[PDB]
Structure formats: C-alpha cells, structure tokens
C-alpha cells in the first residue's frame, strides 16, 4: 500500500503546511484540542479544496475507504506534537462542516450513495448510547492464536485461519478498546416539503465526540456520508442511514 503512504503524506503536508496568514489554523487546532483532552479535529473543506483540489476529488469519490486513512494520517501527526521521545493516543475523530449545497431530505434517492451529503432537519429522539469496537484482541478456541484486530470505520466478520473451524475466535474484552455511538433519527423540517404527506425520517449514527452533542428537538445541519445497512425485516431491499461527520448545530445553539 504505497498509495496509502502517498495519500497520508499529502494529509500530513496539508496539516503542517496550511497557512491562513499567518497562524496555522489546523496545526494549532490540534494542539489546543489535545490539551483539553478533546482528541478531535475539525477540517474546513473550503481550506481543504483551496489546498489541493485533488484530495477533495478523491474524498468526494470514495469517502469511506479514504477518511480513515485521513484519521490515521492526523493521529500520526499528534504523535509528533503532543508528545516527544528518543501513549496511549487514540486515533482522533475528524469533524468536517462545510457549506456546499444543501440537499433536502426528500431529494435523497440513491445515486449519491457514498458521497458526502450536507442536509437539514429537526432531530426527533436520540437513541441510547452503545459501544462499537475499535481495537480488540482475539484468541482462538484451540490453537489459541493471539490476534490483535484493528477494526476501522466504516459488518466485519472475524478471520477463521491461524479444523480449526468454522469460526474459532473469541473476543477478549479485558483488552479491547471501545468508542461510543448514538443513533439520531431526524424528521425533515415542517416548512418544506411536507405537502400533503407525513415527512420521512432517516436514521443517523453519530459517534465518538459528536455523541450527546445534540438535544432532541433542536434544528441542526448534519454533514456525514450517506450509506446503506441490511437489517433483516427481501429481496434484497437494503435500508438507508446517514453516518455523521461531523455535526454542527444551528446558531448558536450552545
């Protein structure tokens, strides 16, 4: 994966060299974020597209295969800032909020699936937190293979190879690093465009530092990727959800 090296080098070069005249907005965004122990970063796409058109050309192409190489790309930077040597430092979440063009809820039909979509709606109720996993160790029921699986985002079955089989892998919960998740569910705004019909509600998964960021009932504008999950209820009929990166409430709202 020299290509991922090529992409991550461009992301480092985007964080370290970026200049708004003359402070480095991101690089200081980083420091001032690790000190308060926020462990997050908010990219402003306009600066991004200003810097290179290219990396935004790919980031609006296949977001879910790229964005995590951006996460690892930035946490590899906080290693050189927040500490120095010659731990532990979670891979930061990035929250990107940008103008673009508002795409109303009714107008989401396929065709933009896995392409970043900014939109606007009133949140109905927030689902109770539950943890997904980030880094979990796994041992085999027989050969006892000790495997540290780095699970990324954005479901993923466990590897069967070190009889043995079919799936002899146990989750060690004593060493496993966990994050959080939310599930907002948002009803589009009553002004537009209900017409004569009840307004649809797309299910959204916030995670890590955006979680509990928003009280249910407050208007917001979400950004996030658009994507689909299975959830047996045929055929095939997969149902739609919006991953959120990252959320920004309306003015102010505090």
């Amino acid at each position: 994966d020299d290509d991922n090296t090529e992409i991550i080098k461009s992301f480092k070069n985007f964080i370290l060299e970026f200049r708004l005249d003359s402070q480095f907005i991101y690089r200081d965004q980083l420091r001032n974020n690790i000190l308060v122990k926020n462990y997050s970063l908010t990219v402003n796409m306009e600066h991004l597209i200003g810097y290179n058109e290219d990396i935004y050309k790919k980031l609006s192409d296949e977001p879910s295969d790229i964005i995590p190489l951006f996460e690892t790309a930035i946490t590899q930077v906080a290693k050189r800032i927040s500490i120095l040597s010659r731990n532990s430092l979670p891979t930061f979440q990035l929250i990107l909020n940008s103008n673009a063009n508002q795409i109303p809820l009714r107008d989401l039909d396929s065709e933009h699936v896995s392409k970043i979509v900014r939109l606007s709606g009133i949140i109905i109720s927030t689902s109770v937190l539950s943890s997904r996993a980030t880094y979990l160790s796994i041992m085999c029921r027989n050969c006892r293979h000790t495997t540290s699986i780095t699970i990324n985002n954005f479901t993923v079955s466990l590897p069967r190879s070190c009889n043995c089989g079919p799936d002899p892998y146990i989750i060690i919960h004593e060493s496993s690093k966990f994050i959080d998740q939310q599930f907002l569910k948002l009803q589009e705004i009553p002004e537009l465009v209900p017409v004569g019909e009840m307004p649809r509600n797309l299910t959204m998964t916030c995670d890590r530092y955006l979680t509990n960021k928003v009280i249910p009932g407050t208007r917001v504008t979400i950004v996030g990727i658009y994507s689909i999950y299975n959830s047996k209820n045929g055929v095939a009929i997969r149902t739609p959800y919006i991953k959120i990166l990252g959320i920004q409430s309306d003015v102010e709202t505090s």
Binding site: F18, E46, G50
Partner: protein, 553 residues
C-alpha cells in the same frame, strides 16, 4: 497640461511641512474607479509618509459645504472625478490669492469634454487633461486666444461676425455628451511607473480600475489589454509552480467570463443571473429559461451539479470548463463570453476574478451599510463607503465575502424585479427615444443608490436590446419609496452587441440642463453625475413631456 512626474514634484514641494502637511485628496465619488485610483494614490503617499486627509464626497452640491467650510493651512489640494464637466473656479471662487499661486488643486477626471474655463486661464489647475485629450482639441484652443480680449464700422461688423463665428463652433463644444476616455487609475499608474514603482497589489488596483467600467462599454479598454498584459509580463512571482506557493501566489491570465460570479456562486445561478446572457437567451421568459437547461443538456453537466456551489464541482468539469464552452456556446450565439481576463489567486482562500471583485465592492456600496432625511441617507452612504474601502485591503478578506453574499442577493432582487417589468411590457417606445418608469416595485430601498439603478438600468437596456433590431434607444428609469417623492431618475446609454462602431455620447446631460434652464420643475442635479437627476411626482409628468420635446437627438 503637464508632465505627470513634474506635477508630482510640484505636489511634493508644496506638501512637506509641520504641522504638515496639508492636503485633502477628494475621493469622488461613488465610482469604483475612484477607489481604484485613490487607494494606489494613498499607498504612494504613505510611501513618502506624507500626511493626508481623504474625503468621501457624495453630492456635487455637497462639495461646496466642505471646501467653503474647512480650509486653513492647505496649500496643495487634490480632487478626483469632479470638475471635468462643471468648473469649480466659478463654483468655488477664487478670487485669486497672492502669480505662483499658493494653493494647487489637482483635478483628476475621466470625463469629457473638459470645462472651457478650466484648462485655459490657470488658477486652480494644474489640469489632469493629459494625455487622453490633448489633443487638439483646437476647438477649445481658438475659444480663448480669439475671444480674449477681442471704415471702423465695417471692422466692427467684421469683428462681431468673427466673434459669433467662433461662438458657434464653441457652442458645438462643451455642449456634448459626457463620456469617459480612459480610466483615471490607468493614468495614475502611468504617473506611478515614471517614479518607478512596480508593486503587485498596485497593479491589481489598476486591473480593478480598468475593469470597473466594462459593465458599461470599454470603450478604449478593448485596446487597454496591451497596456495591462504587458505589465503583467513585466513581473512574475515564479517562472513555474512550485504549488502553490502560499506566498506570491499572485494574479495571472485565465479564460474569464462576463458570466456572473462563476467562482463564488453555483453555476446554474451563475448563468441565470448573468447580465449578458439574460439578454440573448430571453431568461425572463419561462419559454427561454428552458433553453438554458438545453445548454446544460448540451454540456452534459447535470442539473443537480449545476445547482451546487462552484468550489465543490467535480474536477473533470473544471478541466473541461474551457473546452465544453467552445464546443457548445458557439451554437447559441453566446460565442462572445470568453475574454482574456485577469485573476489574482490568494491561494488557500480561493481565487477571485477581476470582475467579480468589482461586483463585491459595488455590492458593498448600497448595502451591508425634508433635507435632514436626504442628508442622513447620503451620510449613510458616506459611512458605507469605507466599509467598501476596507474590502480592497488584502489583510482583511473576512468582510470581502460579506460583499459577495450581498452581490448575489442584489441580483436576486434586481433580476426578479427586472422580470416584474417585462411581464407588464412597461417599455414606452415613444418616438424619438425609449423611456420607462417604475411606478411600483418591491424593496425600493435597494434602488435608492445611483449605482443600483446604474446596474438595473444596465441589465434592462441590455435585455431590451440583443440587438434586436432596430435603433438602440437610450433608456430612462424612475423609483420612489420615501423622502417625499424624490423619484430618482438616471440617464442611460445604449448597448451595442460587441460590434462598437461609435461612442454615441449620452445626451441626457444636455437635455436635463435645457429643462433646468426652462421651467426648472423640481429638477435637481444634486447627484454628481450629469446623467442622473431628481424630480417630484407633481412636476415629473410635465418634465417628461418637456423631455419628449424638443428632442436634442
């Protein structure tokens, strides 16, 4: 009538002092050219650290309040865009004080013809007539040396016959249309290059200046490109990028478009509001609106992708932006769109088209801000001037965008209302000339400013005539909200469809002065421009009838 460098050394010798200096440069007035000029002028002063007073004058009548009130130690004065038409020697008076007169008022103007009393009989000037109309201009030359100071009965009759002989041809002169020869900025740069400053943002000020007026003609500007492009060739930030780099990082040539706000707005909205295209494609019509979409069907650009902001459109469409237009636009008669333009890139912020910047400043001038009310309003415009002055600065970009979010909105107003007119076919073809009046409309607050009606008037005289046979006929507009029936009425000039044979010399300046000299019914030349005047609804109708006849054209 002087060397620019030498007029400069003069304004140098009378300047320095203590408690210096003193000079007040008058920036005037509402014309973006003024800013363009006086900003590079003011930067030039700051270079030698010469103290200055800079005044935002609106009204031509307003200048009298200033010059007559506060002057004490000021031996060297500078003025911009005023006096080319009406002479200030009679208007201010002057009253010669102390040859080698103590105060030198420099008057910079692009307007023609110069006042007769100005250039000859040196008192307050020190004229800026150089070098555009020198000329001769033998018509003003014989106007004085003959006139001044001017068997015996036949010599008296001969003499008087000669006097009227000169007075006739003289009457031909100074009664004429007011038309800008060259942008005052350009000349300030010609003055600036002799001193030796090549500064980049300076040059950008020149580009701004030249491109201030392309909304209205060129006229010479079509040949100003050498005088700019060569200068762009006289410097360069780097031989090759070296992306970006974060500094210098400067202006460059790109295939720019008369298309409106391409870079800071969504593409479809950028055609739909553009001024040149609102004409040829009949966009006020629902039947023509579709023809746009057919354009997009020809380009293969999605409608949804047209609705999206220009920063974020796909890269392929960007690389094909200079091709697809060639492939398609030719077929719609829209082939004149692509200019060779100037674009300054600030890098990581974005880039800005020379023209769009001017759209930002104009946007700033009217928004984003019985005699007491008009004075207070003109005052609000005076304050607003500086809000617009600030946007020129590089170090603050944060408010420049506050201009652009306005520049969009204004069009969304202007276009809208503009269409509100063509639905009712409010155009009166009359006989001698075309004329209109807005009796009612939404949000006349935007239309208070002279320049707003300059742009609406512009999009309308552009819309009515493609051309569009026959006979480009100048247009008239009027609007009223408050200030008790002020009913502002601005003169306009016809637009040729890129094939321009003659300047055509707006005649409303003369036609209005003929009426001020007749019954003068609530006629007010208070606005600095000869084309734009004020009226009352009581006296507007007899004024319109007296406008119809006698027609001077």
């Amino acid at each position: 009538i002087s060397q620019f460098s030498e007029a400069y050394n003069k304004i140098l010798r009378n300047s320095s002092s203590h408690s210096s200096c003193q000079l007040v440069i008058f920036v005037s007035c509402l014309n973006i050219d003024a800013l363009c000029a006086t900003k590079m002028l003011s930067l030039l002063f700051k270079k030698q650290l010469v103290q200055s007073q800079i005044v935002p004058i609106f009204g031509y009548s307003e200048l009298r309040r200033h010059y007559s009130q506060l002057d004490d130690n000021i031996n060297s004065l500078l003025l911009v865009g005023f006096g080319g038409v009406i002479d200030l020697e009679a208007f201010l008076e002057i009253d010669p004080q102390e040859q080698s007169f103590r105060r030198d008022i420099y008057v910079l103007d692009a307007h023609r013809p110069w006042n007769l009393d100005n250039i000859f009989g040196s008192q307050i000037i020190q004229c800026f007539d150089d070098g555009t109309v020198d000329d001769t201009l033998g018509e003003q030359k014989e106007a004085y040396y003959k006139l001044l100071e001017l068997n015996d009965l036949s010599k008296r009759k001969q003499r008087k016959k000669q006097i009227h002989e000169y007075e006739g041809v003289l009457e031909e002169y100074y009664s004429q249309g007011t038309t800008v020869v060259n942008s005052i900025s350009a000349q300030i740069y010609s003055l600036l290059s002799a001193i030796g400053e090549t500064n980049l943002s300076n040059l950008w000020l020149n580009i701004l200046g030249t491109t201030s007026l392309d909304i209205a003609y060129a006229q010479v500007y079509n040949r100003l490109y050498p005088l700019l492009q060569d200068e762009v060739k006289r410097l360069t930030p780097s031989s090759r990028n070296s992306v970006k780099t974060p500094d210098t990082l400067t202006l460059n040539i790109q295939p720019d478009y008369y298309l409106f706000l391409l870079r800071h707005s969504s593409l479809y909205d950028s055609f739909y509001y553009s001024n040149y295209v609102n004409a040829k494609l009949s966009l006020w019509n629902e039947n023509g609106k579709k023809r746009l979409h057919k354009m997009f069907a020809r380009m293969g650009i999605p409608l949804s992708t047209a609705q999206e902001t220009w920063l974020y459109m796909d890269h392929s469409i960007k690389r094909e932006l200079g091709i697809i237009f060639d492939k398609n636009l030719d077929r719609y008669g829209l082939q004149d769109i692509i200019r060779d333009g100037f674009v300054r890139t600030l890098g990581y912020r974005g880039s800005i088209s020379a023209s769009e910047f001017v759209e930002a400043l104009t946007a700033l001038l009217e928004v984003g801000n019985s005699a007491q009310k008009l004075t207070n309003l003109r005052k609000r415009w005076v304050s607003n001037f500086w809000l617009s002055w600030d946007a020129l600065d590089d170090r603050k970009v944060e408010l420049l965008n506050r201009g652009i979010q306005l520049a969009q909105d204004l069009q969304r107003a202007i276009f809208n209302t503009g269409v509100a007119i063509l639905e009712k076919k409010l155009i009166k073809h009359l006989r001698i000339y075309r004329l209109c009046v807005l009796q009612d409309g939404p949000d006349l607050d935007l239309y208070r400013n002279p320049l707003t009606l300059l742009r609406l008037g512009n999009w309308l005289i552009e819309c009515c005539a493609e051309s569009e046979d026959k006979q480009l006929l100048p247009m008239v507009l009027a609007s009223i909200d408050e200030n008790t029936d002020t009913y502002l009425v601005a003169g306009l000039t016809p637009r040729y469809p890129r094939g321009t044979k003659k300047p055509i010399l707006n005649n409303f300046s003369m036609a209005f002065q003929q009426i001020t000299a007749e019954t003068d019914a609530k006629v007010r030349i208070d606005n600095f421009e000869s084309s734009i005047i004020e009226i009352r609804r009581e006296d507007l109708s007899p004024f319109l009838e007296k406008l119809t006849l006698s027609g001077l054209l």
